[PDB]
Amino acid sequence: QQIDALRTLIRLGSLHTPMVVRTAATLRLVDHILAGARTVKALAARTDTRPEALLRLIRHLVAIGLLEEDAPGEFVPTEVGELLADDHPAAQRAWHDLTQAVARADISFTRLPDAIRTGRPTYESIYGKPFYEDLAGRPDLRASFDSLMTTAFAAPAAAYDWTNVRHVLDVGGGKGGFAAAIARRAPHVSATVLEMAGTVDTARSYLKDEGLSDRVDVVEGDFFEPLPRKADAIILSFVLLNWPDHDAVRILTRCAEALEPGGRILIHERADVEGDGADRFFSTLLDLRMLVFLGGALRTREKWDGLAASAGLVVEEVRGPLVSPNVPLDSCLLVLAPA
Amino acid sequence: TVAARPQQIDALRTLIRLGSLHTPMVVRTAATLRLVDHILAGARTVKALAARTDTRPEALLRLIRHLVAIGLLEEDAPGEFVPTEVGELLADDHPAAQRAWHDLTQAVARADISFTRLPDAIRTGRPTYESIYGKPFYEDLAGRPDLRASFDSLMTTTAFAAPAAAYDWTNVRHVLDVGGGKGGFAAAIARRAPHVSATVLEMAGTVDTARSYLKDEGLSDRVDVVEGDFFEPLPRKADAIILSFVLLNWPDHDAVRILTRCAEALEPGGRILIHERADVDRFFSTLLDLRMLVFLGGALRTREKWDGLAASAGLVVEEVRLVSPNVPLDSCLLVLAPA
Ligand SMILES: CC[C@@]1(O)C[C@H](O)c2c(cc3c(c2O)C(=O)c2c(O)cccc2C3=O)[C@H]1C(=O)OC
Ligand SMILES: CC[C@@]1(O)C[C@H](O)c2c(cc3c(c2O)C(=O)c2c(O)cccc2C3=O)[C@H]1C(=O)OC
Ligand SMILES: Nc1ncnc2c1ncn2[C@@H]1O[C@H](CSCC[C@H](N)C(=O)O)[C@@H](O)[C@H]1O
Ligand SMILES: Nc1ncnc2c1ncn2[C@@H]1O[C@H](CSCC[C@H](N)C(=O)O)[C@@H](O)[C@H]1O
C-alpha cells in the first residue's frame, strides 16, 4: 500500500529513465538493432560505446519495456520501442536525440525552480544565448529544429475557407508546410512565408520540391518589424506560444496592420482547456517547455480575448478539435478580425 | 487524409511519458520548494503557496497543473490544492524522506544532473559528475559541508538491524565499519552484541555527525570514530570489518584497493562483510547501478564478479546471505575470508 506510493513517486521523480531513452535515441540503438546487430558486442561497436556500460543501459531499456531479450544475448525492440526507429513517421528518435534542438533544449528543465521563481526562461543560462538567437548561430540546430516542427497540415487547412482569399501570409511559417497545404487545397491562392535566416533556405527547397514555387514565395525577415505585405489571411501557426504576453501582442499588432479589408488572422495553436483528462500530461509538457525554452505559454480562450483586444483584434470563432496524424495532442484554430 | 490510429497513439503516448524530462523535474521542483509541507501548514490557495515558496504565482499554478496531472496533487475546491496519498510522501517528516531525495539543493537530487550527460558515461564508462560540478563526488562534498551533511542524513534512510542479525558475533571482539557513515551499522551491531566494541572509519565532517549520533544512542563508550582514508592503512585491526554500501561507489581497481586494506587489517580468523545489492525490481536495481556509474564510476556486481574482485585482493567469498526489509531493493551480505 505504502510501498506502491513509494514506488510510484520514485518512478515519477526518476531522472535516469528519460535520459536512458534519450541516450538510446542519440546512440541510434534501435536502428542498429534493426540493422542486424543483436549482441552487445556488435551494438557497442556500431555505437562506439563500452560494452559493459551499454549492457547496463540495455538492462534498463528492457526494464521499461522498450527492449526485449529474444534468445540469449540478443535484444530486439518492443512495440513501443520500434517508435525509436529513425524512419518512424512519429520522429520520436529525433525528438529524443540530445544532439538535436528539442532534447538539447529540454536540459532547461534541470533549472525549473529558477523559471518558477521568475517566470523567465532558463535556456539562456545553460547555453549562453536565447533559443532562436542560439539557433541562428548553430546551423545544425536550426536545421534539426525546422525538420522537427514538420512532424501534413491537412486538418488546419480544411478548417478554413479560402474562396475569397487572394493571398496568404504565413508568419513564422517554418518550412512552408501549412502554406503548401493551403496551396494544394485552393489553386487560386498565392502565399508568402515570412521566416528566419537558415529556415528560409529549406523553406524554399520544400516549396520548390512540392512544385509550388510559382505560387508560394519566401521572405526572410522579422515579425516584430513591419510585415512584408498585406494579405486576406495572416497565419500564426505555433508562434504565439513561444512568446510572453507583450511580445505576442506585438506580433498580433503587426499582423493586424497587414490585413487587407475583410482579412483575417489565423492562430493555429494548442489552447489548453480545463477538462482535458488524460490529455493534461502533454498540454503541461508543451506549456512548461514554452516556459523554460522561451518564456512563452499555452493560453486559454479568456487570455486570447485579452491579447486580441490589446492588439486591436477580436476572436471571431474557434474551429474545433483539429487532429494531426502523429501527435499525442489535438490543436485548434482561432479566427481573429479587426475589433 | 489524416489517419489517427489509437494503438500507435497509445505507444506514442507511452514513449513520450518514458522519455519526458519535465515530470521528474516537476516532482523535484515540488520537493525543493517544499510545496507539500506548505500546503499541509495551511496554505491552500496558489497565492499563499507562491508567497511561502517565493515564486511567481502564474508560474506556480502551471507547475501545479502538471503536479495534478501526475497525481501528486488534487484540487479539492477551486484554487485549492491538496496532496494525494502518493503526494503525501513529499511531506518532509515522512519516514521515506522522499522530499529530501528529490531536493535539488541536497546531495543526491543534485548529483542526478550527471544523468544529463549519460551518453558520455556509456561511451567512456566512468562518471560525469565532475564535468558538471568541477570535482569528483566525494571531493565535491569535502568542500561543501551542506552537501556533506545532506548526503549523510540521506544515507541513514530499520536502522541496520536487518543485516545485523545475519552474522554471528560470538567470536567477534572488535568491529571496524570502514566508511560506516553515521554509525548505524556499528550501533545496530553494538546494540545486538554487548561484548563487541567498534570503530567507525569515515571522512571529515561525517565523523562529527557519526560521533554525535553515537552519543545520543548511549554508545560512545562502545563505538569509536576515526577520521581517515580507507585507501590508506586502516587505523587498527578487527575481527569483523564492514563495507556497507561502500564498494559499489568505486570501479574495480579502487574496490580491490579497499579490499586489500581490509584484508591487511584482519585479525586471524577474521572476516570481511560486504553489505550491498548483488545484481541479478530491475527498475530500482538499475537506478542504483546507473547512479553509481554517472556519480562515481561504480556499479552493482554479480556474485561471479565478486569472486574475481575477492581473489585480486587475496580474499575468497565464503557465503552470501535476501535481507528483505520494506524498501524497493533488498540487500545481501557477502562474507569474505583470506585465501
Ligand atoms: C505539446 C505536445 C506536442 O505534440 C504539440 C505540438 O506538436 C508541439 C510539440 C512540441 C513543441 C512544439 C509544438 O508545437 C513547438 O512549437 C516548439 C517550439 O516552437 C520551440 C521549442 C520546442 C517546441 C516543442 O517542443 C509536441 C511535443 O511533443 O512536446 C511539447
Ligand atoms: C537500489 C536503490 C535504492 O532503492 C535502495 C538502496 O537503499 C539505495 C538507494 C539509493 C542510493 C543508495 C542505496 O543503497 C546508495 O547506497 C548510494 C550511495 O552509496 C552513494 C550515493 C548515492 C546513493 C543512492 O542514491 C535507493 C534508491 O532510491 O535508488 C538508488
Ligand atoms: N522574430 C522572428 N521573425 C520571424 N520568424 C520567427 C521569429 N522568431 C521565431 N520565428 C519562427 O517562428 C517559428 C515557430 S515554430 C512554427 C513553425 C510553423 N509555423 C509550424 O506551424 O509548424 C520558427 O520556425 C521560427 O523560425
Ligand atoms: N576515501 C574514503 N575514506 C573513508 N571513507 C570514504 C572514502 N570515500 C568515501 N567514503 C565514505 O563512504 C561512504 C559511502 S555511503 C555508505 C555509508 C554507510 N556505510 C551506510 O551503509 O549507510 C560515505 O559515507 C563516504 O563518506
Numbering used by the authors:
A (entry chain A): 12 to 162, 167 to 354
B (entry chain B): 6 to 162, 166 to 288, 294 to 334, 337 to 354
Sentences from the study reporting this entry:
Next the chimeric pair DnrK RTTD and DnrK RTTR was constructed to examine the influence of the sugar-binding regions R2 and R3 from TamK, an enzyme with higher affinity towards 4 than RdmB. The presence of R1 from RdmB in both chimeras shifted the reactivity from 4-O-methylation towards 10-hydroxylation, with less than 15% of the native DnrK activity measured, compared to almost 60% 10-hydroxylation conversion. Structures of DnrK RTTD and DnrK RTTR in complex with 1 revealed the molecular basis for the expanded substrate specificity. The same inter-region interaction (3.5 Å) may be observed in DnrK RTTD in complex with 1, but the hydrogen bond is not present in DnrK RTTR in complex with 1 due to the shorter side chain of N190 (5.6 Å).
Tailoring steps catalyzed by SAM methyltransferase-like proteins have yielded particular insight into evolution of anthracyclines and generation of structural diversity. Here we have taken advantage of the natural diversity of anthracycline methyltransferases and employed extensive chimeragenesis to probe factors that govern catalysis and substrate recognition.
